[PDB]
């Protein structure tokens, strides 16, 4: 039972690490899409 509780705690820690990785991926995606939208607007303004 202690080994099963340790395995459940390791699975919960892996789920928390996956949630933190998803939050970091969302933050990096927003930080990259900010300059990407800036470059897309700068490219659209020359075509406009």
């Amino acid at each position: 039972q202690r080994k099963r509780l340790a395995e459940k705690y390791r699975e919960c820690l892996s789920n928390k690490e996956k949630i933190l990785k998803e939050i970091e991926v969302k933050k990096e995606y927003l930080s990259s899409l900010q300059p990407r939208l800036n470059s897309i607007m700068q490219a659209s303004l020359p075509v406009q």
Partner: peptide, 28 residues
């Protein structure tokens, strides 16, 4: 007059898009 209204609507849409891009550049 219809073609001029469509061109003015396209120009106002382009100006609104430029203003939104300027607001996004000012916020970021």
């Amino acid at each position: 007059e219809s073609v001029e209204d469509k061109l003015e609507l396209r120009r106002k849409q382009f100006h609104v898009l430029l203003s939104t891009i300027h607001e996004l550049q000012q916020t970021l």
